[PDB]
Amino acid sequence: MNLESLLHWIYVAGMTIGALHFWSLSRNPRGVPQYEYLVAMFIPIWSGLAYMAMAIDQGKVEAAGQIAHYARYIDWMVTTPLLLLSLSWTAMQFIKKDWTLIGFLMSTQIVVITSGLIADLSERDWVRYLWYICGVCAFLIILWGIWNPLRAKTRTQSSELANLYDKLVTYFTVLWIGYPIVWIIGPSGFGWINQTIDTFLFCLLPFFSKVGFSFLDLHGLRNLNDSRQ
Amino acid sequence: MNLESLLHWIYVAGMTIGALHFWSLSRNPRGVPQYEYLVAMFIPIWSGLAYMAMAIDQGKVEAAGQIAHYARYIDWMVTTPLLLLSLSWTAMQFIKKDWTLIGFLMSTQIVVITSGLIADLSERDWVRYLWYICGVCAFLIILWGIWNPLRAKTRTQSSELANLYDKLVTYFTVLWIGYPIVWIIGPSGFGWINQTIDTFLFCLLPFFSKVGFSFLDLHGLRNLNDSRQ
Amino acid sequence: MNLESLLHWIYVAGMTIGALHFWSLSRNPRGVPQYEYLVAMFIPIWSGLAYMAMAIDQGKVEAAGQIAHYARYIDWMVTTPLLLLSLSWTAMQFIKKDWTLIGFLMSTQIVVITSGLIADLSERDWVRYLWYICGVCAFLIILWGIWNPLRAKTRTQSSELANLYDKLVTYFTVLWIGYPIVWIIGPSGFGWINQTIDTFLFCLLPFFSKVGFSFLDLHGLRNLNDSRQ
Ligand SMILES: *C/C=C(C)/C=C/C=C(C)/C=C/C1=C(C)CCCC1(C)C
Ligand SMILES: *C/C=C(C)/C=C/C=C(C)/C=C/C1=C(C)CCCC1(C)C
Ligand SMILES: *C/C=C(C)/C=C/C=C(C)/C=C/C1=C(C)CCCC1(C)C
């Protein structure tokens, strides 16, 4: 709008080349799940065009003098659900049983996204303080509910898979808790920081959450097979 | 906090403890297997935080002087689809190449929800009368279309499962028809009612709709086994 | 109030009887099994009620003196995904372990519709010029990515099915490119054409698309097999 703001723009170029990297990297999975990078390719693609809008200021609406971050949560409505789901496929190379684990995960997932949905669509800073806690609370019960079965449930299913998923949830906990932290104080919450740095922070974090997550999947399996015939 | 309600607040309270009641009953289920409780667990959870918002007045926008209840249909945009799907899994234990039945019910479902979607997002009381007929219309075609195949198509598939379903659709119709009733005249009710009582009626109805199906599914199967191997 | 455009009213009318024509013809289809008609049944029904609203002037919002085509893209959020999906099932009769081809086209379609939303939700004719390019940009990358495997990948998979899909994508490409064309110049895209014509054109195109693909699906298989008794 007023130019001199190529922050969200450069972000776009970063996500674009990100997926292209896998295009030439196809030399990879040669007899092993291709779908792995497939879903991991769509995640950055969609999320890429999203930030592109944040640059052209196409997605915000003026309501009661308060700027609504509609496009902000939107991106967190498509990438997040697929980010946690991408982990389900990573561990489960084959499924046919009932939907108890993936289901309980998808359910609590909806309630969480809902929190951030209105969190950014908050007109008053007083009402936002309540919805914020509502989000961490839901994540508090599920977190403790998944900690025990992290190795207790797979005690009879698969011990090896337990170790892999053990470190997998480790990082998943640091990132998911990362956002809530910045939401505590500062801009868009309770601070004396300019609204400029506000977006500048919520931009680098996601990018830091995508990259780190990518290397995680590659380190999870760590295997190079060559068989398809 | 100037709004004297505290009703929507007490609603979410009893909802939280509702799902927790099962957490303690996990020692052993009754009537239906774990997976059944899984879906029946997410229904109250999400719908719970929803009402909590209705208390803090979080979910209402003023446009042209007319208030919109976008938060109201939202709760009926998540629970309802799962209310129609939950019952589907109640009768169908295993699935492979049979999806024509679930696909036909899911499709007509989207049409109904869409009705209530705009029904509340109406700016004029004149246009609302038109969109209303549209909702009941599609409901009358699917109803008469599901009444006959209730025991006609299941005459060869399964006669036992036919009787069960016959009792299911019974309470399913009286409820689905209950809402459009109050939707007839008056301020979203039977008329001669205020705005306060209005939200109160649409509050108890869902609570009566959720609790009804809960005990319905349990009594539906009524097996009570004790095998785990 | 104040009638002027009854085209949308007559649009839904012929749409209702359209799906009903197959209701009586259910005694026997045009070759494709009942399931094929199932998905093909929801496409017209839903789209019917959509236009019906356009007639009652319910779906557009007056903001900044500009008219928003909210309901316009809405139908392109549910119908479009089903327009291609229906074709996916037509080619893939049975499925077990794949989620490669389907999962690919599905993701690419998510980013496409996205641009279609903001396209009509644009507040400026300048920003809408950039968002559009994004839509066609992703369409070209995926197009060239499906052209080569359209016969290369199916060279060993299925030669017979390859030919069927070869002609399927042909018409699918013309229509998909059809809209982008009209979006270039004219109304809602820098032009001296009346606004009344804008809707008149964007209404006849979908109707030309739906009917076109309908006959296509029936011509794709063109075979009769009686095996039930
Ligand atoms: C790629 C972008 C990602 C993975 C963004 C993730 C955002 C979250 C996991 C946010 C979580 C939150 C809570 C758990 C409590 C409520 C506040 C939120 C939305 C920041
Ligand atoms: C748990 C909440 C539920 C099950 C809410 C259900 C709401 C309906 C079944 C509404 C149905 C309607 C029609 C059938 C006609 C159009 C008006 C509606 C939306 C009230
Ligand atoms: C039944 C209605 C249909 C199938 C409508 C389809 C619309 C499209 C395929 C639009 C495609 C577009 C692009 C590929 C980029 C330019 C923007 C759009 C939305 C016109």
TrEMBL record, chains A, B, C:
This is Bacteriorhodopsin.
